[PDB]
Design a protein around this ligand. Structure first.
Ligand code: ADP
Lengths: 513, 514, 512
């Protein structure tokens, strides 16, 4: 095993980084082609995600593992945009290896990129807008939803799900001192109806998964009840079976269970209880008998789900079975069964709560890819509305911000000791790769369009000119209602700079050769 | 198709880059030496680029084109015949990366032409004009541009010859000069080099004869060009020679044969004869010379073709040939001749040439040990060359790397201001102008990148600041050092380099042969 | 199948030592390069310290093994000077290599090296200047200048430097050692309103909350941490065991039979006085309710470092029994507070009878600022400890090697023997610190060594080297110093290693 001494290790690392970034450079923008993925079995899927593809990627390099780890660790604050950072890092590494061939230490360019990103952020902070009120975030809601979603899962537009997701965040933002929590909103998915049947569960919705839909089931309840005492023969987290060396003990236990059913129904009828949910259960035979004899009630409520049952009512619990009354329970409002299919199981939706801590959305589908794309669009909308309510500052997209930053870097670079201008010119030219790739992904020439838009931006003012991927009329940005958050761009730039610095810092020798 | 022309262009670019890189460490006064080895084993130490370019041999279209370009640059201007190769190499290296992306050569050629025109106009608008209608300003410009070519003692030694050659005021400040049309600087061995003076008419160095008095005035030149050789025999001996008979025949053929021709030729006035070089004559009959000793004898040998061309142009006559000639168009001018030595060895005759339509005057230089004569010849050659270069125009500028950085910054700002896809190609020119200052800083012994960055910062701040010094070894202003150069040596060089680049870029396709 | 003895053996030893010398060289200055090391398991680690690299590498060479053993012993006995000694030994070997093949007996250079080392030690002892409570009036100016020197190493904020000075001055009570490996430090995660906070006691991390967690009092008058290795979780206790399944009365009977013993055990362990249960395993669902019904405290999921810090601060005893305990192996606190900041719940154990550890919370509300900017504070507190404990000090940097080299070169011109060239080579080999320091920063050492030699030719001050301004300034005014006791030990160790290397002439192998 020989040791890589000299400049071959850096060249190999840059080549590996470029070969890795070439995979993400092809799929860029909404006009990207569907990328396929197949595992060991015969499961072949198609999608376009910068995080799903990088997760199931197999590499044989030490730098690729750190790269994909840094790419996956930063995705909760930007949402959509984990593909351009790789291309930016690849272009920066290519410029670094091009400028290093003349005999320049990587420390100089690594320190210059810091001030380059600093001045880029300083220039981007002054070119934005701050005139958003209670109308600028409510009237263009349909335009923002159309720009976020697009036309990938459904050709027509969708206004119900967008308004539902907006209200689900508006009912929690201003209520908890302009703050929102990720654990408060949940995403649920189940096949059934169509995509337009979007429901907003104000309370909590719980499924039961029945076994036989032909069993007579009639709804007739009006008050919920929570208990901790064993309402029925419980299961102490142990798979019970025929562990009795007798034959009459089975009939004895059946008679005892019938007597217990009779006693329980007489107590809930003499005190005023109804659907009492505990934290234990039994087999399916007991539930079948309880549904066949009289009174509809289904057990099987084991697990942490009882926690939500301790929060969707309003009160406390009982430590002993011999401590029950008409005031220690909890009153309800409308607790019944809901089943839109009328052929499957039932669902319970709590419509009585003093706070909003489990608001969720319910979207029906018909396959596996459409529901996944719908949930991805919903997550992206939630992320963008969180970024909007966190800071009322946005910026125009398309590809004008990169050109403006490059122009500002090229302009504010008159004085230079011996490396400042070199670093600023090696960092500015690497920013014009995103619009070039976006224009090359379509059926137009990227070089000519980029030169034309740069000339148009440098001739007159109003830096709001870019390219169009939908083939429309003019190349304006304020007319297509396209917008992009600035915090996400700042985070992406910071992550790219940190990754470039970490790559340019660790490059000495390697132990396994 | 497309692969074959691309491979042909790549091979041509690689060959041109190899030719340009074969010699590069020789620009500036602190250049490196090179020992060229001959085919027989002899080695020669040299440092000039033109000698290495004209000595080596290689078969290639790009190499031959570069050699022709260097020869044309040396013939036209005469100075800086090594920077054009580096400029062409940088332009080809830029065109390589320009074509690697996917740009048509027409747009690249148009951008190169526009950049060349812009640079030429900037160089013409930046340079300052001077005056030369009088003699004081001309002498000042001469003594300011002459004290920066060689060392101090050589300059002080050539200053008398320089001020003697610059005194030739013939053209009344015209557009072009004729310094290469009527100049014939001769060389003479023996004596002191201090005895030099401008001489008109004609200067010779062959003895006429060795008789009595030879101080006459009969045209002083024999306009004759017919054959004077003896009729050769068909073989060695036509018959058997022993006693008489055959001896009397050859005696009469040697004595009473050519004498009749001499008599029939001497019947015309002005008995002045001569002959060319004795490269084809075996031996001349001395009997004819003894018979010609009477009635005035005058003969001058050792005459080349250039001497005949100079005599036929200074006096203003045309030579005649053939034997059947009964005209009278062979006379010249009679004034004074018969000169002696100037207190030393070596025969040399001079004629001032009074009342002549041609006012051609030359400089008769001398020397000793063949060590200070060729040096003075090269010195006066460079002197009259730079004098003609300065009198061709009026613009001048200083060198060191400042104009290159200025032109690079101007081209960068023009590509940033001008719109269009061709601007990128113009940017390539902005990356093909900072090679001379970097090479100078590398040959001096300092950091080239830091010096280039400092020069660029100074040019962006205070416009015209300083450049690169060689004697002191730092960054000092050029206004104190007496060193300048005409604007033509840069404009013509840039135009020739751009033309050569366009010619080598427009040629492609396949290279068929016989 | 070939082997020799003498010159070839020494040449092979020098060539083997050069490999381990060139393996670690760039990691010397403050901004050295990083190195990624991975073994056959599949986990890689990035490190830049020379000791960590030398500890995770083994050489099958006797000379290299002895060298790394001497380096490890020096690092364990002192704590600074691991790569410098190796570089000095490598330079000495490289300088002595050409003076061996010319037919020279190495038994005459050991005396010259010993005399040179003794002269250097004497010069350092006669040139060292110590200052400790003799000027600068009251100690207020002394501590002010100490804090200024601590904040002069890295350009940081003023509040951070003040907090670092407070946390380094509020821990000097019973500590009488020469290293900070006793109290230690711990970096926390999260965010707060301020930039940094200080407290005296044991800290904690995020704790999982359940239903009804506010039943316990937030403030305790006299809490007692229960040091019990057993836990009260659903997996530990049980409500139904191996019993005959017939009806529901047997379940109640067995659960009462178990609850009797459970209540007996809990009342026996609570009658001793302990009430703050710190269970290692996380709590369940009914255990919290049972603890809140008895007006007690419950916890779960705690690391071992926090338990060790609590045992060291509060003075707890190691208990190896569950039941049959006494009231003397228990801990006693004073103030136990629970304050939530942001999205986490923080704990404060203030009032320990043994002031040992203190928590320096550094939370700014980020994810990258916690890991980064962590070596500057460590270097600052190390410099503070070295300036407080040690008395002798001298100007750091490359201002002490050039003077010694010049003195040795001037003294070597007054000896008429074969030791002249030896002392000259020893003085020339001493120039390896500033050249490497300039090469590691990406500068030109050739343009600085000449200026340093010109300045030290007749001055003899404390003019070292610079990094930021890239020039030559006085190191005595830059507020950078070093103890005058570590350099002597490092030079002695290097001389001993060189003597041990040059003393070995051959080796002896044995198959069986
Ligand atoms: N006195 C001087 N000071 C600074 N630079 C000089 C000086 N003399 C010549 N040079 C530089 O040397 C270069 C020409 O060197 P060289 O190739 O040897 O002469 P030539 O070009 O006439 O063959 C010019 O570009 C000029 O800038």
């Amino acid at each position: 095993k020989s040791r890589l001494m000299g400049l071959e290790a850096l060249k190999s690392h840059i080549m590996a980084a470029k070969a890795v970034a070439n995979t993400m450079r092809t799929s860029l923008g909404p006009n990207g082609l569907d990328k396929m993925m197949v595992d060991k079995d015969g499961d072949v899927t198609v999608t376009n995600d910068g995080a799903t593809i990088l997760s199931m990627m197999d590499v044989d390099h030490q730098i690729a593992k750190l790269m994909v780890e840094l790419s996956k660790s930063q995705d909760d604050e930007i949402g959509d945009g984990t593909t351009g950072v790789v291309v930016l890092a690849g272009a920066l590494l290519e410029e670094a290896e091009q400028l290093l061939d003349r005999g320049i230490h990587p420390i100089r360019i690594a320190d210059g990129y810091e001030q380059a990103a600093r001045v880029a952020i300083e220039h981007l902070d002054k070119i934005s807008d701050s005139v958003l009120v209670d109308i600028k975030d409510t009237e263009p809601l349909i335009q923002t939803a159309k720009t976020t979603l697009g036309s990938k899962v459904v050709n027509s537009c969708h206004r119900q799900m967008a308004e539902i997701a907006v209200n689900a965040v508006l009912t929690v933002a201003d209520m908890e001192r302009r703050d929102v929590d990720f654990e408060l909103i949940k995403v649920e998915g189940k096949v059934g109806g169509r995509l337009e049947d979007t429901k907003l569960i104000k309370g909590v919705i719980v499924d039961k998964d029945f076994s036989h839909p032909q069993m007579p089931k009639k709804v007739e309840d009006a008050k919920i009840a929570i208990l901790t005492c064993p309402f029925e023969p419980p299961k102490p987290k142990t798979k019970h079976k025929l562990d009795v060396t007798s034959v009459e003990d089975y009939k004895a236990l059946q008679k005892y269970e019938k007597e217990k059913f009779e006693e329980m129904i007489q107590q809930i009828k003499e005190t005023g209880a109804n659907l009492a949910i505990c934290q234990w259960g039994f087999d399916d035979e007991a539930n079948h008998l309880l549904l066949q004899n009289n009174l509809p009630a289904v057990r099987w409520v084991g697990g942490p789900e009882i926690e939500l049952i301790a929060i969707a009512t309003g009160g406390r619990i009982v430590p002993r079975f011999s401590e029950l009354t008409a005031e220690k329970l909890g009153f309800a409002g409308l607790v019944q069964e809901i089943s839109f299919g009328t052929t499957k199981d039932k669902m319970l939706v709590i419509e009585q709560c003093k706070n909003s801590r489990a608001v969720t959305i319910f979207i029906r589908g018909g396959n596996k890819m459409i529901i996944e794309e719908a949930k991805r669009s919903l997550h992206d909308a939630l992320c963008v509305i969180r970024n909007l309510i966190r800071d009322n500052r946005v910026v125009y997209g398309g590809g004008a911000a990169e050109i403006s930053c490059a122009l500002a870097v090229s302009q504010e670079a008159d004085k230079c000791p011996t490396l400042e201008q070199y670093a600023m010119r090696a960092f500015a030219d690497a920013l014009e790769v995103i619009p070039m790739a976006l224009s090359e992904n379509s059926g137009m020439n990227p070089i000519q369009t980029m030169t034309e838009v740069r000339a148009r931006q440098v001739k007159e003012m109003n830096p709001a000119l870019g390219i169009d991927c939908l083939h429309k009329g003019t190349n304006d940005m304020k007319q297509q209602h396209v917008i992009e958050t600035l915090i996400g761009k700042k985070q992406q730039i910071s992550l790219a700079t940190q990754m470039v610095r970490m790559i340019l810092k660790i490059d000495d020798i390697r132990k396994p050769g | 198709d497309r692969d074959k022309p691309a491979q042909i262009r790549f091979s041509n670019i690689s060959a041109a880059k190899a030719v340009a890189d074969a010699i590069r460490t020789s620009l500036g006064p602190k250049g490196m030496d090179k020992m060229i080895q001959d085919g027989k084993g002899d080695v020669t130490i040299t440092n000039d680029g033109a000698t290495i370019l004209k000595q080596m041999q290689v078969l290639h279209p790009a190499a031959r084109m570069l050699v022709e370009l260097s020869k044309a640059q040396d013939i036209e201007a005469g100075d800086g015949t090594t920077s054009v190769v580096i400029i062409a190499g940088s332009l080809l290296d830029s065109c390589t990366k320009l074509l690697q992306k996917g740009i048509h050569p027409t747009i690249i050629s148009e951008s190169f032409q526009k950049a060349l025109e812009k640079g030429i106009e900037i160089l013409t608008d930046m340079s300052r004009p001077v005056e030369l209608s009088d003699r004081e300003t001309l002498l000042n410009s001469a003594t300011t541009s002459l004290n920066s070519k060689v060392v101090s003692q050589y300059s002080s030694l050539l200053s008398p010859m320089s001020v003697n050659a610059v005194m030739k005021v013939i053209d009344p400040a015209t557009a072009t000069s004729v310094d290469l049309r009527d100049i014939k600087i001769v060389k003479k061995l023996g004596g002191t080099i201090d005895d030099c003076e401008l001489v008109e008419g004609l200067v010779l160095t062959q003895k006429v004869s060795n008789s009595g008095i030879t101080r006459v005035e009969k045209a002083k030149i024999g306009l004759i060009q017919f054959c004077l050789s003896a009729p050769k025999t068909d073989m060695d001996n036509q018959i058997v020679v022993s006693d008489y008979a055959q001896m009397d025949r050859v005696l009469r053929e040697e004595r009473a044969y050519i004498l009749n021709l001499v008599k029939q030729i001497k019947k015309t006035g002005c008995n002045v004869l001569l002959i060319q070089k004795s490269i084809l004559r075996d031996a001349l009959s001395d009997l004819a010379l003894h018979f010609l000793n009477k009635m005035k004898i005058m003969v001058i040998k050792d005459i080349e073709r250039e001497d005949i061309e100079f005599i036929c142009k200074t006096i203003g006559t045309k030579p005649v040939a053939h034997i059947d000639q009964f005209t009278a168009d062979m006379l010249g001018s009679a004034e004074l001749a018969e000169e002696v030595n100037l207190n030393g060895s070596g025969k040399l005759l001079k004629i001032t040439g009074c009342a002549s339509p041609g006012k051609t005057v030359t400089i008769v230089v001398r020397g000793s040990n063949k060590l200070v004569i060729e040096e003075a010849e090269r010195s006066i050659h460079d002197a009259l060359c730079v004098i003609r270069c300065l009198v061709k125009k009026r613009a001048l500028i200083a060198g060191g790397g400042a104009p290159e950085i200025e032109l690079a910054l101007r081209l960068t700002e023009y590509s940033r201001t001008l719109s269009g896809m061709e601007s990128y190609c113009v940017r390539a020119f902005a990356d093909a102008m900072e090679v001379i200052p970097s090479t100078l800083a590398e040959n001096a012994g300092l950091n080239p990148i830091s010096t280039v960055t400092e020069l660029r910062n100074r040019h962006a701040q205070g416009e015209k600041t300083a450049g690169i010094n060689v004697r002191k070894g730092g960054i000092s202003n050029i206004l104190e050092e007496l060193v300048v150069q005409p604007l033509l040596v840069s404009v013509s060089a840039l135009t020739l380099a751009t033309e050569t680049v366009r010619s080598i870029l427009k040629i492609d396709d396949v290279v068929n042969t016989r | 199948t070939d082997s020799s003895q003498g010159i070839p053996q020494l040449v092979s030893n020098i060539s083997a030592c050069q490999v381990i010398a060139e393996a670690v060289r760039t990691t010397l200055g403050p901004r050295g390069m990083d190195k990624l090391i991975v073994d056959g398991r599949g986990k890689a680690t990035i490190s830049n310290d020379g000791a960590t690299i030398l500890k995770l590498l083994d050489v099958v060479h006797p000379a290299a093994k002895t060298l790394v053993d001497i380096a490890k012993s020096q690092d364990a006995e002192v704590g600074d000077g691991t790569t410098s000694v190796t570089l000095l030994a490598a330079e000495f070997l490289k300088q002595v290599k050409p003076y061996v093949e010319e037919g020279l007996h190495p038994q005459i250079i050991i005396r010259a090296f010993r005399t040179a080392t003794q002269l250097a030690v004497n010069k350092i002892k006669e040139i060292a200047v110590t200052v400790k409570k003799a000027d600068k009036v009251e100690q207020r100016k002394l501590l002010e200048k100490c804090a200024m020197t601590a904040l002069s190493s890295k350009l940081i904020s003023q509040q951070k430097a003040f907090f670092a000075k407070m946390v380094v001055d509020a821990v000097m009570m019973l500590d009488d050692l020469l290293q900070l490996k006793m109290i230690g430090i711990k970096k926390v995660q999260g965010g707060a309103l301020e930039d940094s906070q200080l407290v005296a006691g044991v800290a904690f991390k995020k704790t999982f909350s359940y239903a009804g967690f506010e039943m316990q009092p937030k403030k305790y008058h006299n809490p007692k941490i229960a040091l019990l290795n057993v836990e009260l979780e659903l997996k530990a206790e049980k409500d139904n065991a191996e019993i005959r399944v017939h009806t529901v009365e047997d379940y109640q009977a067995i659960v009462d039979a178990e609850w009797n013993i459970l209540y007996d055990k809990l009342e026996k362990i609570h009658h001793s006085g302990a009430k703050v249960v710190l269970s290692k395993l996380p709590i369940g669902d009914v255990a919290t309710q049972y603890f809140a019904d008895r007006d007690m405290f419950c916890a779960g999921r705690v690391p071992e470092e926090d338990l060790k810090r609590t045992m060291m601060a509060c003075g707890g005893s190691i208990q190896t029994s569950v039941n049959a305990l006494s009231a003397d192996v228990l801990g006693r606190c004073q103030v136990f507070e629970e304050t939530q900041i942001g999205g986490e719940r923080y704990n404060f154990f203030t009032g320990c009878p043994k002031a040992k550890t203190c928590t320096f919370i550094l939370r700014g509300g980020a994810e990258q600022f916690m890991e980064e900017t962590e070596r500057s504070l460590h270097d600052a507190i190390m410099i503070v400890r070295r300036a407080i404990k040690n008395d002798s000090v001298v100007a750091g940097g490359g201002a002490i090697e050039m003077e010694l080299s010049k003195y040795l070169r001037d003294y070597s011109r007054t000896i008429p023997g074969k030791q002249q060239l030896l002392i000259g080579a020893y003085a020339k080999a001493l120039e390896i610190i500033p050249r490497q320091l300039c090469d590691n920063a990406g500068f030109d050492a050739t343009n600085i060594l000449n200026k340093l030699r010109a300045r030290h030719a007749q001055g003899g001050t404390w003019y070292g080297v610079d990094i930021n301004n890239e020039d030559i300034a006085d190191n005595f005014e830059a507020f950078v110093w070093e103890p005058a006791m570590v350099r002597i030990n490092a030079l002695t160790a290097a001389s001993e290693a060189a003597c041990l290397i040059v003393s070995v002439d051959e080796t002896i192998k044995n198959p069986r």
